[PDB]
Amino acid sequence: YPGNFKITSHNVYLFSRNIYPNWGQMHRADLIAQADYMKNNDVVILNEAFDTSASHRLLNNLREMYPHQTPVIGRSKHGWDKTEGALEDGGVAVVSQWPIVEKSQHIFQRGGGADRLSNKGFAYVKIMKNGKPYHIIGTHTQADDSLISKDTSRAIRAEQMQEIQTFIAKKNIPKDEIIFIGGDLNVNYGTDEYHDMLKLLNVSSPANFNGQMATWDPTTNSMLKESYPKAAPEYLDYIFVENGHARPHSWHNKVLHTKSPQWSVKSWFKTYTYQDFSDHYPVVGFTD
After folding, report:
1. Phi-psi region of 30 (alpha: psi -120 to 50; beta: other; left: phi over 0)
2. Most buried in the list 143, 173, 182, 205, measured by CB within 10 Å?
């Protein structure tokens, strides 16, 4: 204990097809669920599963491997043990090959810019694996927005990180049980804000961490080459172990740069062809 526990987190970039109809959402819901990186996990955390149909499709495709699932947060009170804490849901779901004995959602109380149009938050699950409990918080926090200052987006993320810690404190989870916190934290590795995030979530950097990677990379990602070709690569997606609770000897993160099969979309008269599952790369968290 925790043993050979493995979590993959992927911000899958499934925006509303009503607003962004031509980004391959329905097809990528198949490609992602068929990909090797989605196999052999204990738990999978999804982010940006916003589009109603594509997200339903993806979660459905994932049922074979991961039958125990939460709803996407911020849709309604249905399918949750508890709800606490907008054109759109929060885009976060958690799926498991292991039974879920508790699941609740918490919608963030602060938000800024375009993020105010979505019920962003976090999902909490308690799963049982072979007689042993595992606690997983999946989340997707406030982004930097052109129309809000970086001080403002930093403050909002700091408040949202506190929402997570307040929930964990209130939960009174036994210290001999492990808590994971993962998803797109929207804090770039190795910055002052990264330092502070460690304190606010009460976590440490995974072992032998390689930050030279980028989980959001316009220099390599075919979808970002189109939309943000000039932006600097960032490292934004993490899976952490909480420090006040049980820990493995070794906890690691690895960014997976795997390309998807080629896929194409049309907009007006023109064909656009891509080879990525999402604009973010998936991250795998594992004990050594």
Report:
1. alpha
2. 182
